[PDB]
Amino acid sequence: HLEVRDEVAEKCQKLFLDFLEEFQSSDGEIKYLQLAEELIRPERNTLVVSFVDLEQFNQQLSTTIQEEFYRVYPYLCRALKTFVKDRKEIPLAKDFYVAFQDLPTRHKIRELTSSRIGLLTRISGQVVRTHPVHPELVSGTFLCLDCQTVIRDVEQQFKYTQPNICRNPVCANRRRFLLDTNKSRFVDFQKV
C-alpha cells in the first residue's frame, strides 16, 4: 500500500549523504564537493569515493555498505544524485554512479563463493579479453499489447525482463509486451 520502505537502505543513504557533504580532506575542505564539481560535465557520471575515508568517517555506515552492497547501492547513487542536484544544474534525468576504492581486504577468485554474493569485495585477476562497449537496458518502459497501458520503470536484472503482470487488473497479460526504447534508460556496459 504505502510502498514498504527499505529502512536499512534508507538509513544507509542518509548516512552516506552526510559523509559526502561532511567528510573533509587534510586541508580542511569538503573533498567530495570538489570532486562532484567535475561531475557536472557531460560524459561524467561516476564519483569515486575511497573506502578508507568512509571507514574513518562512519564505521557502522561503511560496515553496512560492505555487508549489503547490492541492496544499498541504488540508494547510495540516489544520495549522490541529491548531493549534486542542489549544488549545480545537472540534467534532471542524468544518472550518477558511485565507485569505491581502497578496500583494505582482497579476496581470491577461488574465494568468490555464494556467501560473497551481493556484498562488497575486491579481487585481482588478469584481463583475458574485453568485449565491446554496448548500451545496456537498466529499466525499460513497456506497452501492454492487450490494453495499451504503459508499465514504466521495470528493472532488468541482467536479463531482458518484461513486466510480470499488466498493471491493468482486468488484463492478466503476462506475455505480450512492447519495449519503448526512447522512454527507457540505459547504461554503458562492457563485459570483460
Binding site: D146, C147, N168, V170, A172, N173
Partner: protein, 702 residues
C-alpha cells in the same frame, strides 16, 4: 477549489479530488442544526443502530455550509458521489469502528435538490447531471441480483480471477487468466461473487401535471441496493438521480436513427404520502369506555355522505365483522357481514363503496361492468406489463382477509356470477385452467351496490323481484339496504346545502355525536385483534324467531330462516367488537335484532312490510330516542297531506299544517303522550317545523 477547465475532469484530478474529500469530511463532522444539534453524528448513530448503509444529506445544508461542493455536485455527480461515499465511510468508521463488518460501503442520498425538472423537459443538456424529477411509478421489476464485485472462474484451469468492480455502464469482461494466460472462456464464480440489489422502475409524469392535451412521458430509473422496494406501481415519488446516456443502448443496429436510450440512476427516492402498526392502544381503550362509542363510530363513517344512517350502521358492522367458527372442522360459519345496497340511482351507493375502500385495509374495488383493474374471476395468463405467466387470482381472493367491493352488482356476467357465488358460499375459488388445479381462499366480506329493475325500486314488489339477482346470491348477504329515493323538501334542502357547500369549499382557489376522526378510526378498527364470544339470552332470541316464523307464514312473505338468526349472531358479535367488550351484552343482541329485522322487513313487499312493522315495533324501535319515532310519524302525516293538496289543487299550499289530533293519536298508538319535548326538540326545528298552541295546529313553513 475552483476550476481552470471542465468540472468533470477537474474533480477527477487528484489534487481537487483530495481537497473535496477533506472538505466533505469537514462538512460531515461540523454541521449543526441551527440549534446546536450535530445532525450527522446522530444520523450516523441511528443509521448504524438499524444497519441502513445510506446517509441522507440535505442539499440546502450542504450548499449553506459549503457552496463549492454543492455547485460541483450536479455537474459531475458520478465522481462527487463517489467521493462523498468514501468520506462518509471514513467518518462512520471513525465514529463506529465495528461498522466495517456490516456494510463496508456508505451511500449518500442528496435531498431537497433545487433542480426540479419535469420528465417532459429532460434533454441532452441534462446528460450526466444530477436531476430531480417527480412522477408516478407505473412498473417495477422484482429485486434482481446484479454482479457487484465479480469473481470469475477460468474454466480451463479453475483459477478464480480476482474481484472486478461491475460498473453500470458495461459488462466487465476479463482479459487473460493470471495463471494459465488463457483468453478462453470464463464463468462467473457465483459463490465468491458479491451481488447488489437491482430494480428497474418506470416513472411517468403525474396525469395532473400533463395538462394541455398531450401525452405523459416516462423514464426508466434504476434503484440500487437500498432504494429497491422503496417504490411501488402507483406511488407518486420524487426522484433524484443522474440522467444517464452511456451504457449499451445507442441504436447502432441501423434500425433507424442513431438515437440514445437514457435512464436515471436513482440516487434518492422520496415518496409523497403518509407512512400502520399501533403503539397507543391507550387512546383506543379510552374511546372504548366512552359508552357512546357506537354512535360516534356510526357517525364517523362516510363523513361526506349526508344522511343514510341505517346504511352507516350496516357498513360499520360489516367493517368490524363477526366471529368465524368451525366446530370440529366440519361446520364452517363465516363471521363476515356481507352488505347489499340496492337503491335507485343517484343515492351515494358508489360513494359508500369508495369510502369503504379508503378506510378498510385490504379493500379492493371491482365492478360488474368491464371498467375495473381487477376482475371477479381468476384466470391465468401472461401479464401485459410483466410478460410473466401469472395466476391472476381474482378480486375475491385478493381481498381474502379484507373486503371486496362490487359496484353495479346486478350487471355481472354469468361467469362473474358463478365466481361470486362460489367465493361467497364456500369462501374459496377453484381453478382448473392450465395445468393448475388449485383451490385458493377468498374469505372476504362482500359489499355490493345494485340498481333495481327498471331503475326505480318498486316497494309493491319484494326485494328479490326488484333487483335482477338470483335467490342464492341474495341469501348470502346479511344486510340488504334498500336505498329508496323519495322527494322530501327538507331532506332535499339539507342534501343540496351539503353538496353545494362541498363545491364551494373545494374550489381550486382554496347526528348527536362528533364523528371520530378517520385516522384513529382506522386504528380503532385495527383492534379487531381481540376475538370475542357470547353466553347470553337464548330464550328471547328463540321466541323472537318463532314469532317471526309465525308472522312470516301468517302472511305470504319471504320466510325467516336459520340464516337470519346466524346473521344476527354475527351482527351482535360485530356490535360488541365495536365496544371492545370481549363478550356480547344484551344491548348488542338487541341492536343486532333491530338491524336484522329492519333488513328483513324492508325486503318484504309493501303489505307484509307494513303489517310486520306494526307487529314488531317492539323490536324495531330499540335505541330510538322517541323523538325520531314521532318525527317519522309527523313527516308521514304531512307527506300524506301534501300528496292530498298536490292532487285536489294540482299545487300545494305553502306553510302546510296538520292538526295536533292526528299526531297525538299516533303518539298514543306508540304510547308517548309527551309531545312537549318533541316540540322543544332541536330535531323539530332543524326539520323546519313549528306549531301554534292557541291554534292547536302544527305546521311546516315549507
Amino acid at each position: 477549489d475552483l476550476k481552470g477547465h471542465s468540472v468533470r475532469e477537474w474533480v477527477s484530478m487528484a489534487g481537487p479530488r483530495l481537497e473535496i474529500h477533506h472538505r466533505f469530511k469537514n462538512f460531515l463532522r461540523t454541521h449543526v442544526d441551527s440549534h446546536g444539534h450535530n445532525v450527522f453524528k446522530e444520523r450516523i448513530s441511528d443509521m448504524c443502530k438499524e444497519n441502513r448503509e445510506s446517509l441522507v444529506v440535505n442539499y440546502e445544508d450542504l450548499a449553506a455550509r459549503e457552496h463549492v461542493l454543492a455547485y460541483f455536485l450536479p455537474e459531475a455527480p458520478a465522481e462527487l458521489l463517489q467521493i462523498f461515499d468514501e468520506a462518509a465511510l471514513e467518518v462512520v468508521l471513525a465514529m463506529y469502528p465495528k461498522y466495517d463488518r456490516i456494510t463496508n460501503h456508505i451511500h449518500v442520498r442528496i435531498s431537497h435538490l433545487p433542480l426540479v425538472e419535469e420528465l417532459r423537459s429532460l434533454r441532452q443538456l441534462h446528460l450526466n447531471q444530477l436531476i430531480r424529477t417527480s412522477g408516478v411509478v407505473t412498473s417495477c421489476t422484482g429485486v434482481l441480483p446484479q454482479l457487484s464485485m465479480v469473481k470469475y472462474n477460468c474454466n480451463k484451469c479453475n483459477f478464480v480471477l480476482g474481484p472486478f468492480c461491475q460498473s453500470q455502464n458495461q459488462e466487465v469482461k476479463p482479459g487473460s487468466c493470471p495463471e494459465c494466460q488463457s483468453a478462453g472462456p470464463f464463468e462467473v464464480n457465483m459463490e465468491e461473487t458479491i451481488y447488489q440489489n437491482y430494480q428497474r422502475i418506470r416513472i411517468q409524469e403525474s396525469p395532473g401535471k400533463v395538462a394541455a392535451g398531450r401525452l405523459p412521458r416516462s423514464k426508466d430509473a434504476i434503484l440500487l441496493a437500498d432504494l429497491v422496494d422503496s417504490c411501488k406501481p402507483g406511488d407518486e415519488i420524487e426522484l433524484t438521480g443522474i440522467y444517464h446516456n452511456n451504457y449499451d443502448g445507442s441504436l447502432n443496429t441501423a434500425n433507424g436513427f442513431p438515437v440514445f436510450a437514457t435512464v436515471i440512476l436513482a440516487n434518492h427516492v422520496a415518496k409523497k404520502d403518509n407512512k400502520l402498526t399501533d403503539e397507543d392502544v391507550k387512546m383506543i381503550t379510552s374511546l372504548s369506555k366512552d359508552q357512546q362509542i357506537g354512535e360516534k363510530i356510526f357517525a364517523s363513517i362516510a363523513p361526506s355522505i349526508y344522511g343514510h344512517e341505517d346504511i352507516k350502521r350496516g357498513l360499520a358492522l360489516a367493517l368490524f365483522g363477526g366471529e368465524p367458527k368451525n366446530p370440529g372442522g366440519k361446520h364452517k360459519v363465516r363471521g363476515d357481514i356481507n352488505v347489499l345496497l340496492c337503491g335507485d340511482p343517484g343515492t351515494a351507493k358508489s360513494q359508500f363503496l369508495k369510502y369503504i375502500e379508503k378506510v378498510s385495509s385490504r379493500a379492493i374495488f371491482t365492478t360488474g361492468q368491464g371498467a375495473s383493474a381487477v376482475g371477479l374471476t381468476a384466470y391465468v395468463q401472461r401479464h401485459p406489463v410483466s410478460r410473466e405467466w401469472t395466476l391472476e387470482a381474482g378480486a375475491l381472493v385478493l381481498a381474502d382477509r379484507g373486503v371486496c367491493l362490487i359496484d353495479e352488482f346486478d350487471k355481472m356476467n354469468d361467469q362473474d356470477r358463478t365466481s361470486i357465488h362460489e367465493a361467497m358460499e364456500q369462501q374459496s375459488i377453484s381453478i382448473s385452467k392450465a395445468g393448475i388445479v388449485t383451490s385458493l381462499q377468498a374469505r372476504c366480506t362482500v359489499i355490493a351496490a345494485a340498481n333495481p329493475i327498471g331503475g326505480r325500486y318498486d316497494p309493491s314488489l319484494t326485494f328479490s323481484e326488484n333487483v335482477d339477482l338470483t335467490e342464492p346470491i341474495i341469501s348470502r348477504f346479511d344486510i340488504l339496504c334498500v336505498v329508496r329515493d323519495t322527494v322530501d323538501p327538507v331532506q332535499d334542502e339539507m342534501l343540496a346545502r351539503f353538496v353545494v357547500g362541498s363545491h364551494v369549499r373545494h374550489h381550486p382557489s382554496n347526528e348527536p355525536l362528533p364523528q371520530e376522526v378517520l385516522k384513529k378510526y382506522i386504528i380503532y378498527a385495527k383492534e379487531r385483534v381481540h376475538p370475542k364470544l357470547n353466553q347470553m339470552d337464548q330464550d328471547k332470541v328463540a321466541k323472537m324467531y318463532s314469532d317471526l316464523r309465525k308472522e312470516s307464514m301468517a302472511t305470504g312473505s319471504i320466510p325467516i330462516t336459520v340464516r337470519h338468526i346466524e346473521s344476527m349472531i354475527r351482527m351482535a358479535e360485530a356490535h360488541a367488537r365495536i365496544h371492545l367488550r370481549d363478550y356480547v351484552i344484551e344491548d348488542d343482541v338487541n341492536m343486532a335484532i333491530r338491524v336484522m329485522l329492519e333488513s328483513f322487513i324492508d325486503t318484504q313487499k309493501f303489505s307484509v312490510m307494513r303489517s310486520m312493522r306494526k307487529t314488531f315495533a317492539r323490536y324495531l324501535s330499540f335505541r330510538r330516542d322517541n323523538n325520531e319515532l314521532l318525527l317519522f310519524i309527523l313527516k308521514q302525516l304531512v307527506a300524506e297531506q301534501v300528496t292530498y293538496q298536490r292532487n285536489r289543487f294540482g299545487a300545494q299550499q305553502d306553510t302546510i299544517e296538520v292538526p295536533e289530533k292526528d299526531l297525538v293519536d299516533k303518539a298514543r298508538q306508540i304510547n308517548i303522550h309527551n309531545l312537549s319535548a318533541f316540540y322543544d326538540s332541536e330535531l323539530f326545528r332543524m326539520n323546519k317545523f313549528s306549531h301554534d298552541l292557541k291554534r292547536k295546529m302544527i305546521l311546516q313553513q315549507f
